[PDB]
């Protein structure tokens, strides 16, 4: 199993570090990048300790393997075009290549454009309960810039997955603003029960503790913004 | 273009067999792994075959190989909505270490569920926390219905999204529409 940091926000111009690890003590490791829309692209290859070779697009990248179990990717100067999902890859006995969960890296020109999302919850149509005998909840997050949001539904304190359908990609509403939506659908009976609590949580990943920010404004750190509701009628 | 997958986009109904094609030009290739990648996740090896072989089977998944034609194909028998994802085909030569896998551009697969007796209706929802906020919802429509896209500069429509409730095996479709304008009905779209 290979692991790596999930989300990261960095300004353009300064150094960036990505790390990767494995517990099978094999030899060959890889670094891939993939734009959210289409292509999977190779950056660098490490065959063993201190044995690295350029990939298809090594330009703007450099690597370091001082130990077999770990592989670090280094960006000395972050660029705007270097915004994609980065995948560390690994293989043992050349029969199968393992990929990690990926790291979503977003490089911004100005950190001040980073804003948390505005989460709104819409109550189901009365006609829906009337005609379809069921109630659909709809959550909507807007006003956020990095696509580092994770939407989840919570009923009575427990995360549910059944009856949950979230949009796969955030929509570009403005130049520095995105929008994301999702829906939850339960029976009219369950919605008519006032003891039922519904909550739409959106997890936003922002800046770390070690970041520079003005004092007259709230620092957009990693946080959760949610919208709740209760059973009616 | 060393590894060419086809088609560029594939959409099937559930139960049907999905067929993903791929071709190459270099006779050096002897190893062809297929990687499955679910949205928001990394690629994982699903099934692989060697050029010395003619067919590889693993459960509902099967690889057909033509060395003379330098073509191969992945068949997903009794396809389920669960296996709907983007599928990548890779290629290697010696199949030893530093194999240098040549990746195909991948094929996005979507497996639509058979919904019996669809009841397509549009409902308008409301956010109590903020008044005069209109939301449109299209649901229970059939899967072959193509959701219309429109650029009104201020109006946004989401892609269709298949929903699954654990109660009473019956899948459902859904679509979302909204606008920054205070007054607009969902009836006309």
Numbering used by the authors:
A (entry chain B): 3 to 235
B (entry chain A): 3 to 191
How does the study describe this entry?
To elucidate the details of the ligand/receptor interaction, we determined the crystal structures of both free and p/MHC-bound states of the B4.2.3 TCR. Superposition of the α- and β-chains of the liganded B4.2.3 TCR with their unliganded counterparts reveals marked changes in the disposition of the CDR3α and CDR3β loops, with little alteration discernible in CDR1 and CDR2 or in the C domains as observed in other TCRs2224. Resonances from several residues within the β-chain CDR loops, CC′ loop and FG loop were absent in the TROSY spectra, likely due to conformational exchange line-broadening, suggesting the sampling of alternative environments on a μs–ms timescale. These NMR data are consistent with analysis of the X-ray structures of the TCR, which reveal that the Cα/Cβ interface has nearly twice the surface area as that of Vα/Vβ (1216 versus 698 Å2). In particular, Tyr125α in the unliganded TCR interacts with Asn133β and Lys134β in one of the three molecules in the asymmetric unit and has long-range contacts with these residues in the other two molecules. Notably, the H3 helix does not participate in any crystallographic contacts in our study.
Whereas antigen specificity is dictated by the amino-terminal variable (V) domains of the αβ-receptor, signalling function is mediated by the non-covalently associated co-receptor CD3γɛ, δɛ and ζζ dimers, which bear cytoplasmic immunoreceptor tyrosine-based activation motifs (ITAMs). The B4.2.3 T-cell hybridoma, derived from a BALB/c mouse immunized with P18-I10 (RGPGRAFVTI), is sensitive to picomolar concentrations of peptide presented by the MHC-I molecule, H2-Dd.
